[PDB]
From a paper:
Proteasome activity is fine-tuned as a result of the association of the proteolytic CP with diverse proteasomal activators (PAs), including PA700, PA28, and PA200, that can induce the opening of the CP gate into the central proteolytic cavity, allowing substrates to be degraded. In contrast, PA28 (also called 11S or REG in most organisms, and PA26 in Trypanosoma brucei, TbPA26) stimulates the degradation of peptides in an ATP/ubiquitin-independent manner. However, lymphoid cells and cells exposed to cytokines such as IFN-γ alternatively express three homologous subunits (β1i/LMP2, β2i/MECL-1, and β5i/LMP7), replacing the constitutive ones, in the 20S immunoproteasome (iCP) particles—with this alternative expression resulting in a change in the proteolytic activities. We determine the uncharacterized cryo-EM structures of free bovine iCP and the single- and double-capped PA28αβ-iCP and PA28αβ-iCP-PA28αβ to resolutions of 3.3, 4.1, and 4.2 Å, respectively.
We then in vitro assembled the purified human PA28αβ and bovine iCP into the intact PA28αβ-iCP immunoproteasome complex in the presence of glutaraldehyde as a cross-linker. Our PA28αβ-iCP and PA28αβ-iCP-PA28αβ maps revealed a funnel-like PA28αβ heteroheptamer associated with, respectively, one or both ends of the iCP. PA28αβ was observed to be ~90 Å in diameter and ~90 Å in height, and to consist of a central channel of 35 Å in diameter at the 20S-binding end and 20 Å at the distal end. Additional local resolution analysis suggested that in both capped complexes, PA28αβ appeared less well resolved than did the complexed iCP, indicating the intrinsic dynamic nature of PA28αβ, especially in its unstructured apical loop region. Consistent with this proposal, both gates appeared to have adopted a partially open conformation in our double-capped PA28αβ-iCP-PA28αβ map. Thus, the binding of the PA28αβ activator to the iCP was concluded to have induced a partial gate opening of the iCP. Based on this relative spatial arrangement of the PA28αβ and iCP units, we built a pseudo-atomic model for each of the PA28αβ-capped complexes.
Author numbering:
A (entry chain F): 4 to 238
B (entry chain G): 6 to 245
C (entry chain B): 7 to 232
D (entry chain 1): 40 to 258
E (entry chain A): 9 to 243
F (entry chain E): 8 to 241
G (entry chain C): 1 to 245
H (entry chain D): 2 to 233
Amino acid sequence: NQYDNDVTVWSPQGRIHQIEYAMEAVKQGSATVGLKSKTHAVLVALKRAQSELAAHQKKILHVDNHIGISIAGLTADARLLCNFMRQECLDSRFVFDRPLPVSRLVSLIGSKTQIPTQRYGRRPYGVGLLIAGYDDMGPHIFQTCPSANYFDCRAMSIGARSQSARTYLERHMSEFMECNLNELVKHGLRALRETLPAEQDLTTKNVSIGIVGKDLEFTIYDDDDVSPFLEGLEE
Amino acid sequence: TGYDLSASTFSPDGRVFQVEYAMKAVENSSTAIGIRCKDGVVFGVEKLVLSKLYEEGSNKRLFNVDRHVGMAVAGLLADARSLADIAREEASNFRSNFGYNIPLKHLADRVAMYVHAYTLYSAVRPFGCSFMLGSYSVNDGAQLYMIDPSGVSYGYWGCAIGKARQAAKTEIEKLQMKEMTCRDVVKEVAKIIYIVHDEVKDKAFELELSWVGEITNGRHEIVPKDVREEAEKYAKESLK
Amino acid sequence: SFSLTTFSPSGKLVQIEYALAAVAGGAPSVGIKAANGVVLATEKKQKSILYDERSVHKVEPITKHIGLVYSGMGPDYRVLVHRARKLAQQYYLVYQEPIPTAQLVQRVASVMQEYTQSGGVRPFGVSLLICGWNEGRPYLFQSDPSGAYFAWKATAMGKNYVNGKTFLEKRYNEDLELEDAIHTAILTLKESFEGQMTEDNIEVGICNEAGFRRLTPTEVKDYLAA
Amino acid sequence: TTIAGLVFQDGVILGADTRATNDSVVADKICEKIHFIAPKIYCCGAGVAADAEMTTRMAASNMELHALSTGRECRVATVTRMLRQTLFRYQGYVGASLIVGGVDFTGPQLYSVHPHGSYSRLPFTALGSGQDAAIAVLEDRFQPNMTLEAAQELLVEAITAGILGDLGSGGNVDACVITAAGAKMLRALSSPTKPIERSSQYRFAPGTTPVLSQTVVPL
Amino acid sequence: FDRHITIFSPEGRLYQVEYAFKAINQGGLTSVAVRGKDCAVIVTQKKVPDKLLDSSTVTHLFKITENIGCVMTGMTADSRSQVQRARYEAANWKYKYGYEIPVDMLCKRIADISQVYTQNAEMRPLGCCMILIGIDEEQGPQVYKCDPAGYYCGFKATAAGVKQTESTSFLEKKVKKKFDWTFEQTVETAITCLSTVLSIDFKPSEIEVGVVTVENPKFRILTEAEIDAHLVALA
Amino acid sequence: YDRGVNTFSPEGRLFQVEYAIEAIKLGSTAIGIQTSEGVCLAVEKRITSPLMEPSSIEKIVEIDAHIGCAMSGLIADAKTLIDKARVETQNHWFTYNETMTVESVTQAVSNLALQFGEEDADPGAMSRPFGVALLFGGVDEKGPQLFHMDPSGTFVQCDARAIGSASEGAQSSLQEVYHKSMTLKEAIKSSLIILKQVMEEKLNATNIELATVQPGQNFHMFTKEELEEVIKDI
Amino acid sequence: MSRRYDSRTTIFSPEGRLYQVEYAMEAIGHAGTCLGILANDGVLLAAERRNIHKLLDEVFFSEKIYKLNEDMACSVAGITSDANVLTNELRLIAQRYLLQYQEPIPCEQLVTALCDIKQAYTQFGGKRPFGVSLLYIGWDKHYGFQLYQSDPSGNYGGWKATCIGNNSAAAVSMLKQDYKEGEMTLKSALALAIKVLNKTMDVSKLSAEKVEIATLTRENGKTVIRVLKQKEVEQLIKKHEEEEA
Amino acid sequence: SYDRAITVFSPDGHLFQVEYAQEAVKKGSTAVGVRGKDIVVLGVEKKSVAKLQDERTVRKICALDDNVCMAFAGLTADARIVINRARVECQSHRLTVEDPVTVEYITRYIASLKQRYTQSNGRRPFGISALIVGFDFDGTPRLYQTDPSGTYHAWKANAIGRGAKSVREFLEKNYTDEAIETDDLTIKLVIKALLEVVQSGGKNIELAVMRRDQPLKILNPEEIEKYVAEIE
């Protein structure tokens, strides 16, 4: 009623509806999925076009040589926060001269989203993030929330209809560790299929991926390299 | 009525309901307990498994504010990590000021003062998290303090935060915790964790334990997996 | 930061309207300017014997030759005390002379105006009655929270102030010595005050060629003998 | 500029001269120095004239409300902390040399404030250009808790030595007595210099001035 | 409107200031302090609801400085906040005016702090009232009390908390009959005042009593052994 | 009302951003076309009375020599952008000494779209979202390109795009007339066909403005002479 | 900062008017009667006194009449609170003129300078507008004797004769009848103002204490401003008494 | 300080603030101007009452420069701020450029102030709309009107105030290539445009004209009655 007008005012149950409305803003975006092995990490992003004549939007943003991220949420809220993520990673190589640990970057992402919450007049950032990266300890899959909560993950699927993918991620989780780069793409694209409708399924136009690895830096694939990846995969 | 809208506006009975509602949010958080003895202070936390899709070690509920100072928070995780770094800034600025580790009573005061500062202003919101602060030293000894959402600290021989608290506090009163040693106290901590959790609403969980005292040489340290499993087997003697 | 005082549909200020209604129900206070001195007799009532009369005094001097009494809120008055005294300070800083009563009341009444405009702040709840002595001519001024300051030979303020004004209208006239000014100020004070009258219940002070001074309870008891 | 003070058994007396000079010449022969702070607390300035003037003005103004806000007697040590914090705020930019003495609830007390802000408690001292002449006289003949008349004869001779022993010190001697019973001001208590007369007079007859233009405006 | 922020009511009152009064009784405690000839004694109830609660960390008797004692009746969060600022103001007195602040000038600056909260709608007033004691070298012992409104006055004895009129009513029995006030005989009235109204008969471990005397100007809290010596002898 | 410009919906979308796109339906119709021989832009002057001078109405502005622009929606917010849009384009040549890619032109302008807020801002902060939609055409090292932005700041490469009140039926009509290799002059013909259908008035030589950019010719606005030769090919 | 406590005084009415500005002129409408007359040989400004009590002092000068500078003067109708700041600001503005230009300020410049301040507060700042309307008199080197009128909205205009406060429309109606442009001098305008003051004032028994009259004229190259003494006003009462009956 | 957003969007995207600002423009007095060949003529009705108010302070016809003048209809208080700030910037332009100010260069600055102050934090939209008319290089006249929303446009003939649409109906129909051909036709057309809104008008109508490089000249009321004397 009167308690949804701002973030600061607590509900009689001790909840903030504006944070809830920010967490429901992320679920209105595109559905992306990602996973990691004991060696590599693959981020499968679903691209959607505004119209039939319009080209597909870019859901993948390059951050660091070993780091990549997929955005789901308000587009511009991701952009301003992407300028914050890239600045902190550039500051890491500007100061420490090393790739910023992916766990340290996400902790800075939450601190940026904790600032608007406790203050009146500030809106929280309504974009969610699925970020991946490789370091001395191996690849890592991290997820963030507009509530500022962030978790460490083996594999996750965000967006609409993500449970059909997450259920797939639960059954094959045993295989995700020992598969190699070519199989991670096969499991990643087949995991994307469950978030997709029953009509439009898989085309190299609206489907793009990215891969980071042991000695392999993060690389974005679009069409030419994705076409043989889709070949040889049943649905 | 409009009286509970802002924390700066008092109720007709002379109370602030905004601070009260922040306390009700703490009651939904998972249960965390701690006990101090002559040997040190023992920590424990119930970490609920939300899904099997989460990596081991995720959502760590054992917070380390300072080398000799451990912390366990039950409440909003967003305000938890906020105050976590802020409490570390106060301990770091203390060392940058007085050149040693801040005592637990002095640290609990400065942190609680900054919690109460947001209850006065209507342009901000009070913290929705409550936490306990343990410490150990050779001059002071084992000490345990808990800070509520209203920013008031109380000394405790033991405390419980989260959903189930009064039930766990009475179980601690039934036996003397002072003469015990942290090896025997963690046996009771794991025993209480199994009593608090049953299968009704929640599904699965994991035991997160921490020690400070003579065993850890006065430094905040997590319990290893080897001792944790052995400490569970001592509780499995009776629960099972 | 938005102004809490706005114009009513009738043009009056709503906030200052309750400020004047607040000082109308304060502690009864009267004053008289007669001959070479001005008499200030106020009401300090204590609810119990435990109260120490020497700790808190309602009649306070602004400076040697100037003094002030009040009817209204306690807290808002002490804020007026500090700022008016600091204004007399900053006066003596620049001009290095005792401050005239006309200039003292003018710039202090301007402070009352500032909170009828600046936002997030309420107007003062105190109506000040100023006494001063300059160049051999006594001064009796009256200021209210509205910021408009007037001048009076004799007046009344506080609970039942209309009666005190009408009583001095009938009884008081010119050619009254300072001794008669005290005894007239007591008679008009007997009307507004109810109950037994002692030296602790009333706080009296005067201002003359020797400056503003507060009366001790010993000499007040001498005037309680009629 | 010779200013000095002495604490005796029953009180304290602050001496000063009447003469002020600007760098080539005497500005005023009768110019007063000792200022007013509290009825029982008095001070006197030195060094820069306007800086010592304005500083005592802010001191007397701050101490005035402290007497009005407390309603009690003023502490002499309170005056000194006000003076040096102003000197500290400007980092010694103010060249005011101030001596503060008086009688409080504790008793007669004399302090000293250097333009750099350093404060020292002491029974007797002197400040200004002629300070070394008065300090030497007060150092030799001082005795603990002297009689009021004995302290009056000594300090007047101390200022007299500070005058005769300084080029910037002259005129009459203004001594101010402060006792537990009350304070009393003595203006031009000592006048060591008799020759106040002159050997001739100058008068002009009307019409000896070459006036060119003349006009009258009535009022 | 007048009941949300602090502004003049239709009768010229302030309801936010009145609710600050009603916030005092919400503490659930009662304190009393009596001004004696050579002494000043504060008696308050020490509440330890939990067995695990450390008694040494729960104290209602506060020390502003050596010769000044303190006790707080009201919201605990506001109480400890004002005392910290009271120690900031008390030290500012000595750093400025040079000597230990008197109890009258200390209650004045603390009252001026509550005046700023009242006139300004930005900051809310504190729901705690402070009772200060001490001994001035001129007028002797000084016992004062400051409400959240900013009003303070010299009290021969003070009363606060749940019991107010009934606590004062017993204090009227002693002052009207003009009883001799000494160290023990003020402790005789203080314990009897709180015991008869609450129908308890406090034990030495249930209360804490601060004392200051002419011979001992340093404020000190009585030990349970001494309180027991002042209990049985007073029984 | 009872909310800030930063207040989220129960669905999680800003009200101020939603109403910004809804305000473009009140603007002027402009249809851009991307072809292999260049980028074509066309817009109607929308003259409601003979007393007005058509020279004062410029709905097609030139960002750079090879880079054009189109205009719709709110007029007040667009003029503000243009000075910045021109300035950042020259700041590019002032820094890197090269022509800014039209994708970077859309990138620098899209940054200032979202920046709007209330607290924790400067005096140069803007209160309300942009009510303007823009079309950036041009030719660069990659050839002719035509881009579009909305109040939310999203820029997307488009083969053909229409803006304004008639963009609902014009965008659907662009898919019909655009096939494979269709040239600039053929796109100009199809541009006047769709534009004449969507306007309520009659198509005239001085009623609409037509400007095209080519790989071998700088962005050029067709004068009244050439406009009469273009309309007579219908 | 709570947006419920903001009335947003910058809101336009559906007719395009400002509420706080219209409520300001209504408060001025209750102020006492104040008028002025521009005449050939001088300017005349007279006003009544609404506060009447036997214990009043009034040891000062006039009530609603102030002196802006050597060559100018003003009257006051409105809230006496906002009048004190405006009187201070007008004097500050007229003096800041003396800084740069070092000449007596033209009567047109001082008016538009304060009005720019009045409209700035109604434009932004959130502070309430001013509730005082002011009349201005004086002499300048260019236009000579001048009489102006100001409104709290910041609007102003030149006037040969006008009236503000109570009974304003009644005095204006009489100015449209008796006042002779370019004919009646300062002497004839003095008898005319007293006639208008007595007829428009329903309160009987007009006394030298109940009314106030001030004159400003230039004589021998010097601006002469003065306020008629109560005996001098009583002499004018004896003159008008015979005229009246 | 006072910082908040004043002008905010509605469900339809329209701005209630700006719309109410334009309503105050409609209630202003009627002012008109017309571009001639080498000349431009501005005029406004005046509502003076009983020979009381002075005619020196009423003038709504203001000059931004020797070659640029203007007239306004709206709140007379907001116009004095815009006219002053426009003249400060117009001459600051002549500081930056030795050449004079083109009418289009001052119009873009003026309307820009109505853009900023409308959307600025805590500020207020202007309730005025003015005709900025002047002569560009070579002597080509230009006529521009601003908008409280901040938009501006070019006009051969334009009018503002009450009945502004009615005056444009006269202008729209009677303005042809025959119109404003010579000086006698330009003067009559501007007067005949005001003859419809005449209500107890007489001398009260005020007119001004500027010719090539000559400064703005005000046509005295006696010649007004002589030009109104010929209606046939």
